[PDB]
Amino acid sequence: AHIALFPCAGMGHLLPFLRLAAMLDARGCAVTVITVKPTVSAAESDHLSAFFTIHPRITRLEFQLLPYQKSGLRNDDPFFIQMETIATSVHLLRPLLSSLSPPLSAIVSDFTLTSQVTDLVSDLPISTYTLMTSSAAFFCLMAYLPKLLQIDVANRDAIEIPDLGPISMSSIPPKMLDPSDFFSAFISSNVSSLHKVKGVLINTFNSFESEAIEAVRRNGVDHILPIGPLESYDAKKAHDLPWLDEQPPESVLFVSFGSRTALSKEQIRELGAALEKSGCRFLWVLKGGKVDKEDKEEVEDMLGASFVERTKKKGLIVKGWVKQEQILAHPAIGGFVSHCGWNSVIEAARLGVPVLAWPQHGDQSVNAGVVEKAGLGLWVREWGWGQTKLIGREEIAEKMIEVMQDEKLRVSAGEVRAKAKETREVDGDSEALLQRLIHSFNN
Amino acid sequence: GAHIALFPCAGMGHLLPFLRLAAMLDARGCAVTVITVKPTVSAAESDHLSAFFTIHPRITRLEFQLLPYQKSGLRNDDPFFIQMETIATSVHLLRPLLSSLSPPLSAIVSDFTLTSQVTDLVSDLPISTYTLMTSSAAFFCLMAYLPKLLQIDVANRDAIEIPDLGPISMSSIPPKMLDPSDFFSAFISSNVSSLHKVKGVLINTFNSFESEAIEAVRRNGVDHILPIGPLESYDDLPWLDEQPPESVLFVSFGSRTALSKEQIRELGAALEKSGCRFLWVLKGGKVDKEDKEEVEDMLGASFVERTKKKGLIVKGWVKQEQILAHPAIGGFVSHCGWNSVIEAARLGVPVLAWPQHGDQSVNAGVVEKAGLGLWVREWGWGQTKLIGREEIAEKMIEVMQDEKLRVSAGEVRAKAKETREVDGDSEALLQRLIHSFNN
Amino acid sequence: VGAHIALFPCAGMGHLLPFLRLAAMLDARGCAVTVITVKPTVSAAESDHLSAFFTIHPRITRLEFQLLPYQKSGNDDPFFIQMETIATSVHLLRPLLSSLSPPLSAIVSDFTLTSQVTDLVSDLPISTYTLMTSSAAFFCLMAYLPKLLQIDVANRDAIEIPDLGPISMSSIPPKMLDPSDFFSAFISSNVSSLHKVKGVLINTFNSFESEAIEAVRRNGVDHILPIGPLESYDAKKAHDLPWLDEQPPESVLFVSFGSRTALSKEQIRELGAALEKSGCRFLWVLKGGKVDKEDKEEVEDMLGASFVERTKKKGLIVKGWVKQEQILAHPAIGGFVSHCGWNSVIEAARLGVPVLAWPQHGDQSVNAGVVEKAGLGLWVREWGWGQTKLIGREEIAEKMIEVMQDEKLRVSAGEVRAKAKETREVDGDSEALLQRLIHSFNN
Amino acid sequence: VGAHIALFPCAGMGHLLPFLRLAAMLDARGCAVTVITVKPTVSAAESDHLSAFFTIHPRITRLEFQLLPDDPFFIQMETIATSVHLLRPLLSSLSPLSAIVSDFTLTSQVTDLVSDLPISTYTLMTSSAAFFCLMAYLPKLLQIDVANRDAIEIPDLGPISMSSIPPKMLDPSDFFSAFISSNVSSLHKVKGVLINTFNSFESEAIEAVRRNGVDHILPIGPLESYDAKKAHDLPWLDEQPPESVLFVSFGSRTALSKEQIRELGAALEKSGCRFLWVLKGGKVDKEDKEEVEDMLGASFVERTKKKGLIVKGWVKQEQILAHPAIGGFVSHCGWNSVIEAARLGVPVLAWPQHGDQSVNAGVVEKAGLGLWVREWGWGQTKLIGREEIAEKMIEVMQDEKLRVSAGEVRAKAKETREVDGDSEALLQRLIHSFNN
Numbered sequence A: 001a002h003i004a005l006f007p008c009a010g011m012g013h014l015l016p017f018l019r020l021a022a023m024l025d026a027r028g029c030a031v032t033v034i035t036v037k038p039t040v041s042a043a044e045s046d047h048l049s050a051f052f053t054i055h056p057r058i059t060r061l062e063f064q065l066l067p068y069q070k071s072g073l074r075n076d077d078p079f080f081i082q083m084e085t086i087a088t089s090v091h092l093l094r095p096l097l098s099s100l101s102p103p104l105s106a107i108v109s110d111f112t113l114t115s116q117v118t119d120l121v122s123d124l125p126i127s128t129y130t131l132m133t134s135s136a137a138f139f140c141l142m143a144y145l146p147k148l149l150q151i152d153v154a155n156r157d158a159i160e161i162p163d164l165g166p167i168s169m170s171s172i173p174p175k176m177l178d179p180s181d182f183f184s185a186f187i188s189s190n191v192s193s194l195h196k197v198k199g200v201l202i203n204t205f206n207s208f209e210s211e212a213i214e215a216v217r218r219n220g221v222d223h224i225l226p227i228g229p230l231e232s233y234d235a236k237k238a239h240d241l242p243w244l245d246e247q248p249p250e251s252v253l254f255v256s257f258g259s260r261t262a263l264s265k266e267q268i269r270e271l272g273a274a275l276e277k278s279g280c281r282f283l284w285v286l287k288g289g290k291v292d293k294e295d296k297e298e299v300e301d302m303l304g305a306s307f308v309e310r311t312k313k314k315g316l317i318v319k320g321w322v323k324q325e326q327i328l329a330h331p332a333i334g335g336f337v338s339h340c341g342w343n344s345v346i347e348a349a350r351l352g353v354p355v356l357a358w359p360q361h362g363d364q365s366v367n368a369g370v371v372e373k374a375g376l377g378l379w380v381r382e383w384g385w386g387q388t389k390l391i392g393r394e395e396i397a398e399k400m401i402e403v404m405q406d407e408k409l410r411v412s413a414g415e416v417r418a419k420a421k422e423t424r425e426v427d428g429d430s431e432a433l434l435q436r437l438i439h440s441f442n443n
Numbered sequence B: 001g002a003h004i005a006l007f008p009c010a011g012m013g014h015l016l017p018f019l020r021l022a023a024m025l026d027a028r029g030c031a032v033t034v035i036t037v038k039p040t041v042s043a044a045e046s047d048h049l050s051a052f053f054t055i056h057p058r059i060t061r062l063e064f065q066l067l068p069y070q071k072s073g074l075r076n077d078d079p080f081f082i083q084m085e086t087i088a089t090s091v092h093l094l095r096p097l098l099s100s101l102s103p104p105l106s107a108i109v110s111d112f113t114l115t116s117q118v119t120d121l122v123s124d125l126p127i128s129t130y131t132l133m134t135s136s137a138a139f140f141c142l143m144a145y146l147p148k149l150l151q152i153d154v155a156n157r158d159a160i161e162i163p164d165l166g167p168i169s170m171s172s173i174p175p176k177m178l179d180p181s182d183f184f185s186a187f188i189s190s191n192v193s194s195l196h197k198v199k200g201v202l203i204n205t206f207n208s209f210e211s212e213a214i215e216a217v218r219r220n221g222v223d224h225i226l227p228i229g230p231l232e233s234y235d236d237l238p239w240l241d242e243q244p245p246e247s248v249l250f251v252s253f254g255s256r257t258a259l260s261k262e263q264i265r266e267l268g269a270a271l272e273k274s275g276c277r278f279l280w281v282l283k284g285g286k287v288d289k290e291d292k293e294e295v296e297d298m299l300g301a302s303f304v305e306r307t308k309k310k311g312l313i314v315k316g317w318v319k320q321e322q323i324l325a326h327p328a329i330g331g332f333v334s335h336c337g338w339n340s341v342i343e344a345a346r347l348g349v350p351v352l353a354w355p356q357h358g359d360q361s362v363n364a365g366v367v368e369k370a371g372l373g374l375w376v377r378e379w380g381w382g383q384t385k386l387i388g389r390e391e392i393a394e395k396m397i398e399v400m401q402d403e404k405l406r407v408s409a410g411e412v413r414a415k416a417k418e419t420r421e422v423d424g425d426s427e428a429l430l431q432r433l434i435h436s437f438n439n
Numbered sequence C: 001v002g003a004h005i006a007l008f009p010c011a012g013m014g015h016l017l018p019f020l021r022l023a024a025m026l027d028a029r030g031c032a033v034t035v036i037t038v039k040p041t042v043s044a045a046e047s048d049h050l051s052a053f054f055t056i057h058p059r060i061t062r063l064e065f066q067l068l069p070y071q072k073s074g075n076d077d078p079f080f081i082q083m084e085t086i087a088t089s090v091h092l093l094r095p096l097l098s099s100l101s102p103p104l105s106a107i108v109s110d111f112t113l114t115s116q117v118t119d120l121v122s123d124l125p126i127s128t129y130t131l132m133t134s135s136a137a138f139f140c141l142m143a144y145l146p147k148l149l150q151i152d153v154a155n156r157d158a159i160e161i162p163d164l165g166p167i168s169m170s171s172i173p174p175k176m177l178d179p180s181d182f183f184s185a186f187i188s189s190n191v192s193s194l195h196k197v198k199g200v201l202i203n204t205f206n207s208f209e210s211e212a213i214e215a216v217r218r219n220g221v222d223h224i225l226p227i228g229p230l231e232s233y234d235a236k237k238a239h240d241l242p243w244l245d246e247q248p249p250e251s252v253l254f255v256s257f258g259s260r261t262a263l264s265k266e267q268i269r270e271l272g273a274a275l276e277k278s279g280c281r282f283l284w285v286l287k288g289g290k291v292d293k294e295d296k297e298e299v300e301d302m303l304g305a306s307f308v309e310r311t312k313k314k315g316l317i318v319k320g321w322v323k324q325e326q327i328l329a330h331p332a333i334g335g336f337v338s339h340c341g342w343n344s345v346i347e348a349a350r351l352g353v354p355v356l357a358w359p360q361h362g363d364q365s366v367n368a369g370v371v372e373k374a375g376l377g378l379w380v381r382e383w384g385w386g387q388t389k390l391i392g393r394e395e396i397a398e399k400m401i402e403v404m405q406d407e408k409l410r411v412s413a414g415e416v417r418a419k420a421k422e423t424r425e426v427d428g429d430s431e432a433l434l435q436r437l438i439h440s441f442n443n
Numbered sequence D: 001v002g003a004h005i006a007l008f009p010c011a012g013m014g015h016l017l018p019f020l021r022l023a024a025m026l027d028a029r030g031c032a033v034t035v036i037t038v039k040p041t042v043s044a045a046e047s048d049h050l051s052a053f054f055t056i057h058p059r060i061t062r063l064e065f066q067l068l069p070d071d072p073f074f075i076q077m078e079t080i081a082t083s084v085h086l087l088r089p090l091l092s093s094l095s096p097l098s099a100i101v102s103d104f105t106l107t108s109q110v111t112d113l114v115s116d117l118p119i120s121t122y123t124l125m126t127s128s129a130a131f132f133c134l135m136a137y138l139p140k141l142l143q144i145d146v147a148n149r150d151a152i153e154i155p156d157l158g159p160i161s162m163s164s165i166p167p168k169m170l171d172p173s174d175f176f177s178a179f180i181s182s183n184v185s186s187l188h189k190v191k192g193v194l195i196n197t198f199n200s201f202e203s204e205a206i207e208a209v210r211r212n213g214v215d216h217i218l219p220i221g222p223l224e225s226y227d228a229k230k231a232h233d234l235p236w237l238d239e240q241p242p243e244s245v246l247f248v249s250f251g252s253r254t255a256l257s258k259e260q261i262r263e264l265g266a267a268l269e270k271s272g273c274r275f276l277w278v279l280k281g282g283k284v285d286k287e288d289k290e291e292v293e294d295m296l297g298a299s300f301v302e303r304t305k306k307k308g309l310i311v312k313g314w315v316k317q318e319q320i321l322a323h324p325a326i327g328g329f330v331s332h333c334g335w336n337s338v339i340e341a342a343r344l345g346v347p348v349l350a351w352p353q354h355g356d357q358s359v360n361a362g363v364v365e366k367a368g369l370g371l372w373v374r375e376w377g378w379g380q381t382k383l384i385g386r387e388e389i390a391e392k393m394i395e396v397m398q399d400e401k402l403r404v405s406a407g408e409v410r411a412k413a414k415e416t417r418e419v420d421g422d423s424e425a426l427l428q429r430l431i432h433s434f435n436n
């Protein structure tokens, strides 16, 4: 059994695949990870090198992707644009995969690359699997998109997905409904070819999304396999830990908005105003420059010296990559503020951190809903879309205060934390399924 | 400097012609949107749509999601025709989408099959409606008269007179056209009746080619005929570059028609008998490219090996415009579907006409009458009757042989060229049409 | 495999499983098979079954029909509303059938929807056939219901069909004898649409039902073909009989009440008590949910702790689904307790396993009658429609002991198995017809 | 300095030099400027200028598009269009643009681009207000007349003769017409238009564009020099008396034949003007040009070696024109050059070889900036005598009125350059409009 992982662009796409790959390797499959160059963000490149030196037996397959060529799919995002570039070049890898010395039994592809990858292994003896980065609830929305697009003539309230509670129209992203945009075209193109996949891997546990996992199973994606939460490859040298150790437990509030999400210039100053006003201890990851890490070459001239001095007693503001999974594990962090990209969300759940939900773009709003549903965190729907909306200091601060002091949440959040543990256990469903899956791989 | 939207109907024959026009309008400074629908019937349509847009970025594309097929009286057993029924129900979906188009629509060019439903869609909206017709004028004359024809017994009639043109033989009319329930008949009949509500009816033919019919249509209701043929290309060779000029015979039956297994064996045998170097495009999968998974298991292992010196046969989407243009090809064997015929004229390639179904027989006659190609009546309908290798062979040789025929096609080729010219009538008509659109 | 064949099963395991078997049989015999399914499936099991079929038999394509919203009133049955929701979307087979590459030479449609596809077989001239999943004697009663329900509609000791042993009214379901019930309308209307069919296949042979084959032949079904017993499909597993290996041959009683739950909880317990008294070693597959796989969430709350412990070393209980055919085939199994669903009855005869008959509902009672006549099993008539009467453990125990020690039955039962094989063998009568039908089909 | 801006010129120094000045001007006004360039660059000089510009301005970022596979300058302008999508990644990774200012030639391709990555876009024209309208009114004119007449009229603009108009622009078939006509149509998308002009130079011209639907035209002329400092070159410049030197530059490309060029070379010595001559060998390409000063002849060099100096290659024009020594300018009349002359107040003689320039010569005449002879016409068409030239050449040196008229023009240019004046005011305003 030889298994190959093909992640797309983004640390949200990259991190999950590497994490699984390490898990697969630990459980004894021969694992190859497919990377292509160049990569959009510095972290992906730096990470890949670190991952491989830590895991030596995993093979690295590197292919330089063809120069960006396109027609259609209006895209204004660098990570999405790279995904299109990888997808248009996946068909040129057929010659290489055919001749590999230890031939691949199966490929675990990225959702975005599933259509091109499914065509690629058509006449090769390789099972095709897809790993889903996002939540199961978002997958229900993805499955319903053709039905949603066909019967979506009216802009009114929410659409009832068939086996679970109806989602508000505000939660569905406007880009998803426009067929011209890449987000919609890629979502639609991949769901059509999901039927050619042997199994679809998900990063949620049965306890976390019982309705969403069950609804998809009866809605035609009958091969769904929950394997979440994914485990860290625990490879790390740089220590940014020291300030936290000084902090009392649970005092600190962690704010981060993912790998490639940035706030408005008015929002960065209003969020900073709220952090001061709240009086809470905090850790802020500032990603003012934007998605790309390389072009975000600025160095804390977003707030000014005046602000740092006021907050230094209660806060540390870090601009750069931070070891998020480690920070979350720390006794000091009792709160998290998230765009609710799923991988952060899953981590918050595994480590039991209360979450304050703040979607900016795409699936974040629905995932925010899941986060609210499970008690993981508090979500304010009225806030709506970050990047489409601005929230003042008064509003932000009160919520920040409220999350820090909800004991019901802290108690509730822990319960999810326990459930995530059970699933990893040998009895627990998620590990068992993977163990079940792994055997399958041997053919 | 106006917004005009073009809405095609299912199939390549109905899709390629619309795209070529959309590109053509864009060339002349028109803002253009193309209203496509999902999902497609065929891979080619989907593939072509994507390519077109990458090549003509200025052109907008509008995507519609199909409703499910709906029970209606009509009898249909064809995948493409069925899709047409589905697209037709779906037009009403359009209403809210039209009210928000970035630049307000000046007019919408709709398909003949989609004309009845589209005309009602914008009856209230201040939008001029035009329709573009895939088939020939000669067929069109038959279509216009169908509603009258539907009420007359017309049985045991060898031939039926058409009002300002000579009567078509019954032989060249599809039986299903004259049975009211069948979709083919119903869609043609229903749409003609609504034609009055269209400002103009665009036909992919030119005055030199179809002059008698073009007048004939005009004097019987449809005075809004605007021939602007032949539509330009919006925009397998390696074997060909090796070939001698004119030495190659090209066989194709279009994007949505396949030949019976018994018939197919005979055709290959004829090609072997003929000895003409040939490029044969084979569709064994009846109609669908997605479902035509068979890969030359149709001819046999032995067959190709013998024919390798004198032939190349492919199963797959050939580029028809480029193959015809190439110097080598000396004849076309065609179902005589109009778009194919129209490209045949443009490149002055002699055609041996073998209509298979539907409009094709009337079209076939125009091919012969024009002197473009030779058609034998006795062969009648393909997919209804099968003809021998021996008969097929003589005819295949003859088209290659005839030099008068080669000369005749050239006159057809020049006339086609003439219409394109700024002086020429068809190019002039499109421009006149363009002026009219009023923002 | 030149000829192109599609079989369409609408709903229920009993309907679904035989059709898959016919499909497998056709492919083995040189047809190219498409299998049509309608989603969402009523039960998890059909879906479980279908996915495995396609993965196990990969040269057979899967054609799915997505069902439309339904809302009719007059809650009946979940498989009867699904049988009528498949007829509310049976015009969605038009686009699919027109697109199929090698066009259909013949389609085999479940008898529940033969009246709705009539129009579809005229437009696209598909020679259509249908496979009956009931007994040949119960199909006779189904096939004469229209002519019997024209005359005085009432109940007598025995109602008679033309040329076969009169059927008692205690074997006939009461809802079939009232002409204003849903049931009759669907049966009367689909027997009228049997004249448009080119052949009618049934899952039986002529040694098993000699009179029914001729009674059905001399009463309006001259194109009836008995192709029984249907062959078994593959599944790849077996961690269901660790105890079965330890148990001695022919010593184990297999209790199955079919795809769905049968008797009331109170009644079952008496059998459980009954099983204990008998001493029969047993493998029991219990379906808690009387009709839905998805709905059944009960476990050890059906029989009580009291029983499960006492039989701990002598019998095992499996909740949910088991591979019934593989189990019966096992050397260990020596008796069968059945609800006498017809499909189950034909395999018992096919596998030569002795039956104790406990028909619960519907056609099962007539099947019980067939089992008796064949000499396949022991049947008690007075036990009655399920839940009609409560049967004491002592009465149940005696029949069970009688089944274990009844030698003539084994001899007769052994004799039935040889005949079933005889039909399957290439010279065989049932085998001959299936081979013949393919010969007729035209490319 | 909050606002962040990017410039994009495809080809020619006709466009790049102005764009860069636009880039520098924008940086001065508090704008984060990114300059986008196309590679490989057609000319070694074009490449040469860019490296210097970034190096001279550290704080202006450079973003580049590598290019995928008639006139080289026109064809390349065509190539940039092919690869325009390549722009898409670049915009996505930017540290996002408040606006982009793009070349006229490729505006049509970008329209799709602007709409997906929402960026307000502008174009800056390197041609005169009178000529832009001829481009601007061209599309209607071509379809309506389809004929050749001695003079043509742009609605509120005094008709200029066909003789000025370039022949290729006239032909419908020609590639040039498609580019010009198409692009103006695309002109609708832009939230502003900029031309290197001031109202005073062409009140009539600017108005017609305002009248004619180019409502959004903004004239920001003259553009400030983006320059190097300080090189000890032209010791031959400092030496001479004020206004003693005639500087000759026919372009950023060659313009006339060796025999036609020889007549001016012979005319120059008869004229007696001291001169600094910029002589380019390549008709259109600096890399292509590998000829020494043998078109003029050995003899010419020996005779005049004290009198004047000849530079083969490139020189800094603004730097040279600004000098006290320069009192006369001979120009091929490319607008960028013409504008430089007005801002520097140096009398011009107009000898336009090709294209827009003859119309540009007309503007000079209305202005009083320089002396022009219409009859000389399109370059290489006719041979103009050495004797005929000198009389005009001497006249340029010794005309008192011209000096006065020229003096005003420089004065007029400044007033717009200063804070009160409109060209300065609009720049201030546009930047203000720009939204973070």
Ligand SMILES: O=c1ccn([C@@H]2O[C@H](COP(=O)(O)OP(=O)(O)O)[C@@H](O)[C@H]2O)c(=O)[nH]1
Pocket (backbone or CB within 6 Å): A010, A011, A012, A013, A015, A256, A257, A258, A259, A260, A261, A285, A320, A321, A322, A323, A324, A325, A339, A340, A341, A342, A343, A344, A345, A347
């Ligand atoms: O400064 C950062 C930002 C993100 N992450 C990691 O990036 C992962 C993926 O982020 P997510 O998917 O939550 O958001 P996205 O980047 O996809 O929008 C998370 O697990 C974080 O651990 C990190 O380690 N440091």
Ligand SMILES: O=c1ccn([C@@H]2O[C@H](COP(=O)(O)OP(=O)(O)O)[C@@H](O)[C@H]2O)c(=O)[nH]1
Pocket (backbone or CB within 6 Å): B011, B012, B013, B014, B016, B252, B253, B254, B255, B256, B257, B281, B316, B317, B318, B319, B320, B321, B336, B337, B338, B339, B340, B341, B343
């Ligand atoms: O393999 C093919 C088949 C079709 N065509 C083009 O498809 C168009 C449609 O053909 P037509 O409508 O005449 O036949 P139909 O598709 O209607 O049966 C014609 O322009 C052909 O040139 C092609 O280029 N390659």
Ligand SMILES: O=c1ccn([C@@H]2O[C@H](COP(=O)(O)OP(=O)(O)O)[C@@H](O)[C@H]2O)c(=O)[nH]1
Pocket (backbone or CB within 6 Å): C012, C013, C014, C015, C017, C256, C257, C258, C259, C260, C285, C320, C321, C322, C323, C324, C325, C340, C341, C342, C343, C344, C345, C347
């Ligand atoms: O637990 C089970 C129950 C049934 N079956 C099979 O599925 C069919 C269902 O039985 P039947 O239709 O005779 O009874 P019903 O469906 O009416 O309850 C039979 O062929 C059995 O062989 C099985 O494999 N496992």
Ligand SMILES: O=c1ccn([C@@H]2O[C@H](COP(=O)(O)OP(=O)(O)O)[C@@H](O)[C@H]2O)c(=O)[nH]1
Pocket (backbone or CB within 6 Å): D012, D013, D014, D015, D017, D018, D126, D249, D250, D251, D252, D253, D278, D313, D314, D315, D316, D317, D318, D333, D334, D335, D336, D337, D338, D340
């Ligand atoms: O030797 C030379 C020739 C030209 N230019 C510059 O060329 C630019 C643009 O020239 P213009 O567009 O007027 O002429 P063209 O490029 O059309 O020939 C002006 O800014 C001049 O300063 C220069 O600096 N040195």
